[PDB]
Amino acid sequence: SDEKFTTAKIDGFKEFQNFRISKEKIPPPAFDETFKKFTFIKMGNKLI
Amino acid sequence: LVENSVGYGQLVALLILAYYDPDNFSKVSAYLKEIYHIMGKYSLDSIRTLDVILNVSSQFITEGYKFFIALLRKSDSWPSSHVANNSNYSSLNEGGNMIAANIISFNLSQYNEEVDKENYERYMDMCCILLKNGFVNFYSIWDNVKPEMEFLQEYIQNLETELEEESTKGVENPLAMA
Amino acid sequence: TFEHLNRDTLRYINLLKRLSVDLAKQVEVSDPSVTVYEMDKWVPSEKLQGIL
Amino acid sequence: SVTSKYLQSTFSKGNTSHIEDKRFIHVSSRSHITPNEILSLKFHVSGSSMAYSRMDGSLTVWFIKDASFDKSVEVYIPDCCGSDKLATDLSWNPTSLNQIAVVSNSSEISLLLINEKSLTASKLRTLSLGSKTKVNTCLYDPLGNWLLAATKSEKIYLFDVKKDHSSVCSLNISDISQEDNDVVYSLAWSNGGSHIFIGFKSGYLAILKAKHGILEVCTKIKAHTGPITEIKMDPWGRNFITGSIDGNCYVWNMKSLCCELIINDLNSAVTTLDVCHLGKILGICTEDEMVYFYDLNSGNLLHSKSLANYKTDPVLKFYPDKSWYIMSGKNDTLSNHFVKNEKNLITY
Amino acid sequence: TRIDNGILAHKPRLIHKYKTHEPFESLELNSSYVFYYSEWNSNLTPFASVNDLFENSHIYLSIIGPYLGRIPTLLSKISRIGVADIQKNHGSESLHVTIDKWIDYVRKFIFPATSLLQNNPIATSEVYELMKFFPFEKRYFIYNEMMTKLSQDILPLKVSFNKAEREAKSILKALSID
Amino acid sequence: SPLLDAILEIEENFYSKIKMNNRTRYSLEEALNTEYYANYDVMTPKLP
């Protein structure tokens, strides 16, 4: 860790210049809570 | 570390003591006062000393996590008026201690040498513990670890195409071929 | 005096969990139901505990 | 990988002794014939005795005192349980150190106390039931508290061994199966007599409660698609292993009763199976004259062999007090196995 | 059990407990390993009624997706819960309501999963032991929809179907009297 | 050189005392039970 911190200081601590702090407002997600419907074809396919 | 050797020496030695103490749990305050006395005497930094605590703590995290969390909970490097939640969709990115976030997001992207590949597990586990008691908010860690979202999406498209092809077309497993 | 007191404190704390020496742990359990024993929940007899 | 090396060493040039029985010297004299059989072979609990019964009618019992059967006495006895009738199953009565229960596909259960000073096996008692009833399997609760006797159809009896084998209860198999013409194929006790596990032929598996001496049907699950051959239990008491004839070997979790691990390299029927006293290695004897040794925790093959058309029907059994196993040889002759310097796996 | 001085003596087996970082417990031949962070399940509350099972299926299972098949035991547990729930009210008049609701559930969450399995009969046996309670029209509906619309237009299902089909043809070319 | 020599000799004496205590205790507790077969690998300290 000391070696890594030395080589990071060498470049002038540029590795901490970029940090990307998020600023969005996170909304509560929506979950589909419904089941699909069934067609008119009682059996599987038209022929049967 | 090499700049004020004596200084860090004392600190890290003291830290080992705390994890080898049977009554360490009821002497949190004495340890915090000792660490402040030391950090004062030889003018250690706050950033580097937080890192030194994190490393030799993660080294004992398994069966030290109780005392570790109590220690950080009582030290003034703990965000007390804007504590992160990490358990509510509307607050996954608000609050925390952004300096600890910087140091952690840094130490989590070093997997190039050979020595850290064997401690990445314990370090990730310590961060995962800290990341649910509100020490740092999640997105502040997510947005800053190594693989960028674009490279992830590229790897994803490659895996999707390769999988779909190997599924639909298929591949002949050579039994006695050639 | 302060230096002696610091060094003695480290020895005492070291000498508790780290350099402690403990009992043999011979085990015999009366209940027939107990078919598996933890081997860490073994404790010494109450009479011996008072003497210790 | 320690276990693989251990098993390889157990299959080496040395570390193996021929069990010198009547059939062994017979083959030695006639080779240097039609092999009768080995109907059954079952240890004592304390790992210091062994018993088995060929098809001729004679049951041999050894008092293990040596590794390679050097100083092991042998009480050979002629065709017990009648001259016409031969033994089919025996239980070793974990209560005492000498008693034995033996059944001969008849309505009579023979309790004999084997003596070691002489070579005399003296009939101690005979138990009888309905005249038509033809029981063929006997079992002992691993605490020596209940005895079970089962028919190929329409009879199951439980005696209380403590109170001089007073007939405690019975049950009609048709009440347990409720299917078309089922024939119980294999039974087994739970660790500590509390439940009886029964495997029918139609595929079903039933769990009966035998807590206070009154049988009752707890549950029935459609385990397999063919007849169930063997049912074994883990010694630690966390899972029970089921092996079938359809080529499957499953291990069911004990607390929840749901499949947890499956053996998939198998492609043939199972004739028997056994698991070591440490609950670590699982030995499968399939029907293509081949044995396999799997690992219980992971479920991947760790050793294979080949019987090579010698003694078509094989037998396997792991010691209850050491990591050794008796396995059949060439012509219905037993073949011990050991390492001679490792009593248990842990010592290795 | 051991024979000492010519008498039987029973003893219990002795094991010890170790703490590791692997999540799943085990017992390696003398000692039992456990996950160290023994209060990881503090933030979660188990279900109290099958209605809660629906309400939380809509969150966890809709995420795990067609990959539920990677854990067979969950299929068995949910299917046995369904069987017992249908059996509990065989007498009552509202049975057809529960039957319709479990029909929808098995259509949307379980059957796509069981379509992914690999040479594991017993799990399918359980799912069918639950399915046995429906009108056969509905079973044919589910089977045909799975055949026509969900094999295509979903990647991992398509991969598994193609693998199974190629394997079936490969075996069919090698059937003999010998 | 001699400084490090002496200090490492002392640390050796230290760990020797620890290991002697633990080994004697384990041998006794092993020979005192039926099928204990203690695990000599782990040596982390534990409160008596």
From Swiss-Prot, chain F:
Q: Where in the cell is it found?
A: Nucleus
**Where the shown chain sits in the full protein?**
289 to 336 of 752
Which N-terminal stretch is annotated as signal sequence?
Answer: none
Per the UniProt record, the source organism is Saccharomyces cerevisiae (strain ATCC 204508 / S288c) (Baker's yeast)
> This chain belongs to which protein, by name?
THO complex subunit HPR1
Look up the further comments and give them: HPR1 is not required for sporulation, and is not essential for DNA repair. It is probably not a DNA topoisomerase.
Listed disulfide bonds for this chain?
none
From what superkingdom does this record's organism come? Eukaryota
Quaternary form?
Answer: Component of the THO complex, which is composed of HPR1, MFT1, THO2 and THP2. Together with SUB2, TEX1 and YRA1, THO forms the transcription/export (TREX) complex. THO associates with DNA and RNA in vitro.
Reported function: Component the THO subcomplex of the TREX complex, which operates in coupling transcription elongation to mRNA export. The THO complex is recruited to transcribed genes and moves along the gene with the elongating polymerase during transcription. THO is important for stabilizing nascent RNA in the RNA polymerase II elongation complex by preventing formation of DNA:RNA hybrids behind the elongating polymerase.
